[PDB]
Structure 1
């Protein structure tokens, strides 16, 4: 899992490759991403500011004239959402602009996060109805949130983890949910807040339904069960479920401030099942021994979801020690689902 989303960072041009039939543009590789650029705007090795997909860029026709026709209103401001595109057949994701367009970054170094100085914020799809409830309090500071870094941003890490084994799970398109025990308190959280129980709150309903609160009372340990709530009325319901349900993907050990490993998590899920508490888990694929490029990893992401008749969002890879994870989102999914 991870820190702040570095939406805009100083990165380096990698290989530049022609786009057949399109002499005014070319393909720039930037880490594990491919970005269409104007012909000659970069050469291999040049630095630039790379803005990832899901960046929302406030309207400014001087700095960002290439975005001018894509301006929308979003959370009260005018600007452009960057999203996946496919131009002269070339997949294109993000925006890469030369350093000389940013005189205020004259003193910066390759790798720097420039999101805040450039005023970039994150676009997200709208939240689903009964997933915001009354707030009890902050997302607990003693539990990690569930964000995962992208494979495209991890090129040296993927190389450094050659030979290491990963649990591979299907990435479900829902909302992150955490149900935890800390001493005398059991709480249910969404992605960012701890929620109050009401008749209408979806997370609480899913936690009562699968007896996972009872399961935590049984284990008698300070643990956060983290998973995806999916189903009807949640993010278009890709799985075509009836009703909603929680699918575990991680367990956080609150007292040790660490995740359980995949084998430790499997064992505890088995113990819960063995004692009548059936908490469902995200689909687990074959463990992978890593010996792969980012491209090769991305090529794995499309495939069957929980519902084997639909094409999945992607995959999450969790190293067997529980200390290194990342996501590989299916670019076919991003192409199909323009609201993603």
Structure 2
């Protein structure tokens, strides 16, 4: 959701050597615009990277040349770009190119009204199993808002403390117990156990079904399956494996705090259910701009010889979380 939102032109700074364009700051994003398209304070529809914008030469002539066939529809995937050393992310169009939003307000999500959908990398061949049912409605999914979209929330949380973990580039995976049922899920579906299903294999490998059966509580262990043939196997692992990053308390419909999650992992491991965790870095006391957070995102991954996709920050009360994706990672890996 909110691929296209009405946002406010922030600081507008010139681009040396290029006089037809200039650099516009939209929340935490930097977005290249045609010169004089906006002034600071102007409103416009901002389209985030990963938006897919169906072909339309009169509304989106600036995307005419990057049109591709994507799930049977012709349009443009909005990706990170660096053109003359200037980072550029997203599309920012003045409001008067959208006469049907004339009465909308700043901050409105105009995604459906504009027909924007989301581009996604092809999901891994062996992570597409047999579906057993919907993703359980009593378990939260694992979406993380971007630090770029959280400027006022980054300031209100000044002084709060955050668990910092490495963001692993795999697939979201959930293993849960609710009363007399234990299932294994992908990002969007609960799956059937088969000999080839990867999620089920990684859950049997670390005995985490037996772990939830030992703990006797309604919990969802949420983590990332990574490894061979999963999103290009950044970490160069052999085989595939699950790395926990969250535990959802189903009965209380809230996530466990980081210390609760580490205590629960401790008791699992200690009882012979060794479930690995995404790498944990130093707790961070928040006193930063989004630019500063974004600058932290680059670094070593689980495999400390590769550059990580980014970092995830989870407040110590478990009630506020976000991710910061490394823009170097986005400029190196075009399928992200």
Q: TM-score category by the smaller chain?
A: over 0.9
Report the CA distance between 1:129 and its aligned residue.
Answer: 1.2
Rounded to whole Å, the distance in 2 between the matches of 1:321 and 1:22 is 47
**Residue in 2 that maps onto 1:44:** 40
CA distance in 1, matches of 2:106, 2:140: 29
Instruction: Work out the CA distance in 2 between the residues paired with 1:218 and 1:338.
Output: 43
Secondary structure of the 2:237 match is coil
Deviation of 1:89 (Å)? 1.2
Q: Describe the SS at the equivalent of 1:144.
A: coil
1:130 to partner: Cα distance: 1.2
Question: Which residue number corresponds to residue 135 of structure 2?
Answer: 139
Equivalent in 257, 281, 289 of residue 261 of structure 1: 257
Paired residue secondary structure (1:221): coil
User: Is residue 328 from structure 1 mapped to residue 328 from structure 2 by the alignment?
Assistant: no
Structure 2: 5+ residue stretches without partners: none
* Moved segments of 4+, more than 2 Å: none
1:180-217 CA distance string (max 9 Å, x none): 00000000000000000000000000000000000000
Q: CA deviation at 1:87?
A: 2.1
The equivalent of 1:123 in structure 2 is 119
Following the alignment from structure 1 to structure 2, what is the Cα–Cα distance between the partners of residues 152 and 211?
38
Measured after TM superposition, the shift of residue 279 of structure 1 is: 0.2
Other structure's SS at 2:63 match: helix
Provide the residue aligned with 1:172 in structure 2.
168
State the secondary structure of the residue aligned to 1:285: coil
Distance 2:168 2:27 in 1: 26
Post-superposition Cα deviations, 1:124-151, rounded to whole Å, max 9, x if no partner, equal: 0000011011010000000000000000
Q: With structure 1 as the length reference, what TM-score do the two structures score?
A: 0.99
**CA distance in structure 1 between the aligned counterparts of 2:33 and 2:204, rounded to whole angstroms:** 51
In the alignment, the residues of structure 1 paired with residue 125 and residue 100 of structure 2 have an alpha-carbon distance, to the nearest angstrom, of: 42
Per-residue CA shift, 1:63-98, capped at 9, x if unaligned? 000000000000110000000001221100000000
Aligned length: 336
Query: Aligned partners of 1:171 and 1:300: how far apart in 2?
Result: 12
Which of 205, 220, 227 matches 1:209? Answer: 205
Which secondary structure state, in structure 2, belongs to the residue aligned with residue 296 of structure 1? helix
Root-mean-square deviation (Å) = 0.4
SS class of match (1:13): strand
Cα distance in 2 for residues equivalent to 1:75 and 1:107: 33
Q: Which residues of 2 match residues 274-313 of structure 1 at below 5 A?
A: 274-313=270-309
Which runs of 5 or more residues in structure 1 are unaligned? Answer: none
When normalised by structure 2's length, the TM-score is 1.00
1:19 lines up with 2:15 in the alignment? yes
